């Protein structure tokens, strides 16, 4: 929720690109999707987030014993600009009634 | 099948001429850069409109 | 469920470039200048 | 312990090279080819051959519909759901940036007066 | 060495995906990209209601050959059992989703598509196999085997 208001202070003030805080990283593909719905699974979140790129490999944290999701996934794309696009875009999204969170 | 020749009508030329005369007469005070604006405006006013027929 | 529409229609990058309405350019006043669309250098 | 420590360590190579951006790495690779062009092509102009064919033409990939424009112009993956799920910040961010271009011009129009 | 790990993974669709993306229940047969109403396609044809192309429906109860009503197709339509389905049908053999009728663009043309209803559906007393759009031509008949009702299609002319 705090993200979207950082993108609004970044757009409103005329940040103009490379000083963007996605340049904070430059080293990292893997993204963090928290607040995910428990019914979701690999193939699903792959099908939704391959929109903005091609996701190479994602490890979704699912509790070892019960074998169900703890509610979040660390994902890895083939492209960084896909990550920048995904954090800056896909965030604040409704899924099954609950708004997911994303960040680097 | 045919050819149409264009020519700029008399009354039009008369209007333009009265427009230049308007620029000279109505400005005794106004700045010299201002007059040139008046000229340019009138002149493109003629040329963009008539174009081919002018030549 | 895809989100579908008839035809395609148009993209976005352009679909909102130039001002709006605005109207021509004054009654046609001499004082205006405005002949050139972009600066010299 | 050689093959095992090379499972974990060569996995450090694998997931290390994978981590960053496999897409990013190839683009970097292309630059390396560019250096090769320099060795033979010190100062190329026009008709020299690469330019020739160059102007002589002017792995599943997703099929259905269209993918909305992405600042960086990336086609979606193979099995992608085929549905736009977004905050719309791209468009609006995309639209707003375009609006500014109109603004610089109508800013100018001001100057002559 | 029967089951190494008890959970593993899926790589499969989620019920909330297909659910949320189609709801009246969740439905099947999301309209294709082409679908457009017939009246506006008669507007691009430049046709007032006099010369316009409107598909009217005709009913005959399969036992007795007329109108319980008459139905326009101009205003796709979901043919189902009755509430979800727009084109409700009192037929007790229709699955909760029986079939669909979508007008598509190939020209504005009518199309019938079976949803894979358990019994099937007969076209001119000749069934069609599931999961493909089948164009309909005027005077064609709908009811897979002998079906409490019948149906016919008519363009508006004369």
| Four-CA torsion E43, E45, E48, E54, nearest 10 degrees | -90
**C 1-40 → E contacts, CB under 8 A:** 1-2, 4-6
> Which of helix, strand or coil describes residue D44?
coil
Within 8 A of A39 by CB-CB distance, chain E residues are: 14-16
Q: How was this structure determined?
A: cryo-EM
Can you tell me whether residue B16 is helix, strand or coil? helix
**Nearest neighbour of A37 by CB, restricted to E10, E11, E16:** E16
CA–centroid distance for E70 within its chain: 17
- Measure the N-to-C terminal CA separation of chain C; round to a whole number of Å: 53
DSSP for C4-20, written as a single string:
--SS----SSSTT-S--
* Beta carbons within 10 angstroms of residue D64's beta carbon: 12
Q: CA distances (Å), E124 to each of E104, E133, E139, E140, E146, in order?
A: 21, 16, 9, 6, 12
Task: Give the three-state DSSP class for B45.
Answer: helix
Subunits with 3+ Cβ pairs within 8 Å of C are: B, D, E
Cβ–Cβ gap E7/A46 under 8 Å: no
A83's tokens: 């990550």
H and E: helices and strands count for chain A: 3, 5
Note which residues in 4-33 of chain C have CB less than 8 A from chain D.
Answer: 4, 8, 11-14, 16-19, 31-33
Looking at beta carbons, which residues of chain C come within 8 Å of E16?
none
* Gap between the Cα atoms of C33 and C22, Å rounded: 17
Chain E CB contacts of C2 under 8 Å are 30, 33
Question: What is the CB neighbour count within 10 angstroms for residue E110?
Answer: 20
Give domain limits for chain A.
1-104
The number of C-beta contacts closer than 8 angstroms across C and E is 17
Residue of D nearest to E34 (CA): D65
Q: Which two tokens stand for residue E48?
A: 């007032």
DSSP code, position A55: B
Strands (E), chain E: 55-61, 70-72, 77-81, 88-89, 97-105, 108-114, 122-123, 126-127, 134-135, 141-142, 149-155
The answer to whether residue A46 neighbours chain E at the CB level (below 8 Å) is yes
Q: Where are the alpha helices (DSSP H) in chain E?
A: 15-21, 38-44
Q: What CATH superfamily classification does A1-104 receive?
A: RRM (RNA recognition motif) domain (3.30.70.330)
CB of E32 within 8 Å of any CB in chain D? no
């Amino acid at each position: 929720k705090l993200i979207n208001e950082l993108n609004e202070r970044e757009v409103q003030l005329g940040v103009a690109d490379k000083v963007s805080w996605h340049s904070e990283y430059k080293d990292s593909a893997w993204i963090f999707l928290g607040g995910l719905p428990y019914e979701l699974t690999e193939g699903d979140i792959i099908c939704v987030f391959s929109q903005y790129g091609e996701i190479v490999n994602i490890n979704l944290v699912r509790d070892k014993k019960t074998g169900k999701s703890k509610g979040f996934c660390f994902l890895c794309y083939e492209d960084q600009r896909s990550t920048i696009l995904a954090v800056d875009n896909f965030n604040g999204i409704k899924i099954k009634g609950r708004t997911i969170r994303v960040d680097h | 099948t045919a050819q149409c020749f264009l020519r700029v009508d008399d009354e039009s030329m008369q209007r333009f001429h009265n427009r230049v005369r308007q620029i000279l007469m109505a400005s005794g005070s106004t700045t010299f850069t201002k007059i040139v604006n008046k000229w340019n405006t009138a002149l493109i006013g003629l040329m963009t409109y008539f174009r081919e027929a002018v030549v | 469920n895809p989100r579908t529409s008839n035809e395609v229609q148009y993209d976005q990058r352009l679909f909102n470039q130039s001002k709006g309405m605005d109207s021509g350019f004054a009654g046609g006043e001499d004082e205006i200048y405005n002949v050139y669309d972009q600066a010299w250098r | 312990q050689r093959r095992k420590a090379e499972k974990d360590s060569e996995r450090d190579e694998l997931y290390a090279q994978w981590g960053k951006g496999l897409a990013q790495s190839r683009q970097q690779q292309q630059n390396v080819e560019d250096a090769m062009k320099e060795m033979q092509k010190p100062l190329a102009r026009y008709i020299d051959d690469e330019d020739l064919d160059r102007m002589l033409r002017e792995r599943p990939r997703y099929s259905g519909p269209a993918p909305p424009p992405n600042r960086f112009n990336i086609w979606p993956g193979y099995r992608w759901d085929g549905v736009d799920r977004s905050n719309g910040f791209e468009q609006k961010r995309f639209a707003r940036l375009a609006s500014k271009k109109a603004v610089e011009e109508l800013a100018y129009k001001w100057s002559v007066e | 060495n029967l089951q190494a790990q008890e959970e593993e993974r899926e790589f499969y669709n989620a019920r909330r995906r297909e659910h949320r993306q189609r709801n009246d229940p969740g439905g099947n047969n999301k309209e294709k990209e082409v679908p457009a109403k017939e009246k506006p396609s008669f507007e691009l044809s430049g046709a007032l209601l006099e010369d316009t192309n409107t598909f009217r429906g005709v009913v005959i109860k399969y036992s007795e050959p007329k109108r319980w009503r008459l139905y326009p197709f101009k205003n796709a339509y979901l043919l189902g059992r009755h509430p979800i389905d727009h084109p409700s049908c009192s037929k007790q053999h229709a699955v909760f989703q029986y079939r669909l009728v979508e007008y598509t663009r190939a020209r504005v043309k009518p199309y019938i598509i079976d949803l894979g209803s358990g019994n099937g559906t007969f076209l001119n007393n000749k069934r069609i196999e599931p999961q493909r759009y089948y164009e309909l031509k005027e005077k064609d008949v709908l009811k897979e085997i002998d079906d409490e009702d019948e149906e016919e299609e008519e363009e508006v002319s004369d």
